[PDB]
Amino acid sequence: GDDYTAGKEYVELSSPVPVSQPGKIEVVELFWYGCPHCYAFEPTIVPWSEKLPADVHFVRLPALFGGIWNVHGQMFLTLESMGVEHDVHNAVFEAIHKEHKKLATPEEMADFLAGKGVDKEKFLSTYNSFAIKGQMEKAKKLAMAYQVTGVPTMVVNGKYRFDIGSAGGPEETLKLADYLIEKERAAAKK
Ligand SMILES: Cc1ccccc1CSc1nncn1N
């Protein structure tokens, strides 16, 4: 009969946000190019996310809160729109937190991406296109609605907000995530 405290481990939003399509549970993690905590979470969240059933869907959304925040995230959405899969996405975080070659401009981004199999022309073509902007505004209005006041931040079904600090550790974050998945799943368990 329960095992977590509201506000202590996970915080429930007074104003919840509905997902686009029902049936599957929404799991969003708002990472940033300036959060070290997100880097140490990668080798821990991957084995969990890539082992989830066909009832849970993880989404990669950056902390687009204007300023330099949105700038340090658009690059990711650009790659996802390129149609590349299993292109060693983790290598990107490496050049950001291990090297930190000031990836704040498209030039530096393309220069680095070109070394892993990325066309500078395609990149810049869609980068400066509305195709990415439509995604940017989409995540922007959702991020602030998910009550994301920090990074990282795991949001489940736009109702429960938690993170490493709130949970009490990277492992505790996974505990809360799995618990909340069943929490929402129970509201529609046939
Ligand atoms: C918000 C966006 C931008 C880019 C890729 C995927 C998405 C859809 S993810 C989403 N849409 N409504 C709720 N939710 N978490």
UniProtKB/Swiss-Prot annotation:
Coiled coil: none
Regions that span the bilayer: none
Cellular localization per UniProt: Periplasm
A GO cellular-component term linked to this record: outer membrane-bounded periplasmic space
Domain Thioredoxin: 2-182
Record keyword Lyase present: no
Disulphide bond pairs: C35-C38
Main location: periplasm
Key words of the record: Disulfide bond, Periplasm, Redox-active center, Signal
Entries under Pfam families matching the protein: DSBA
GO BP: any one term: cellular response to antibiotic
Molecular function GO labels: protein disulfide isomerase activity; protein-disulfide reductase activity
Function: Involved in disulfide-bond formation. Acts by transferring its disulfide bond to other proteins.
The family this protein is said to belong to: Belongs to the thioredoxin family. DsbA subfamily.
Protein name: Thiol:disulfide interchange protein DsbA
Designated gene of the protein: dsbA
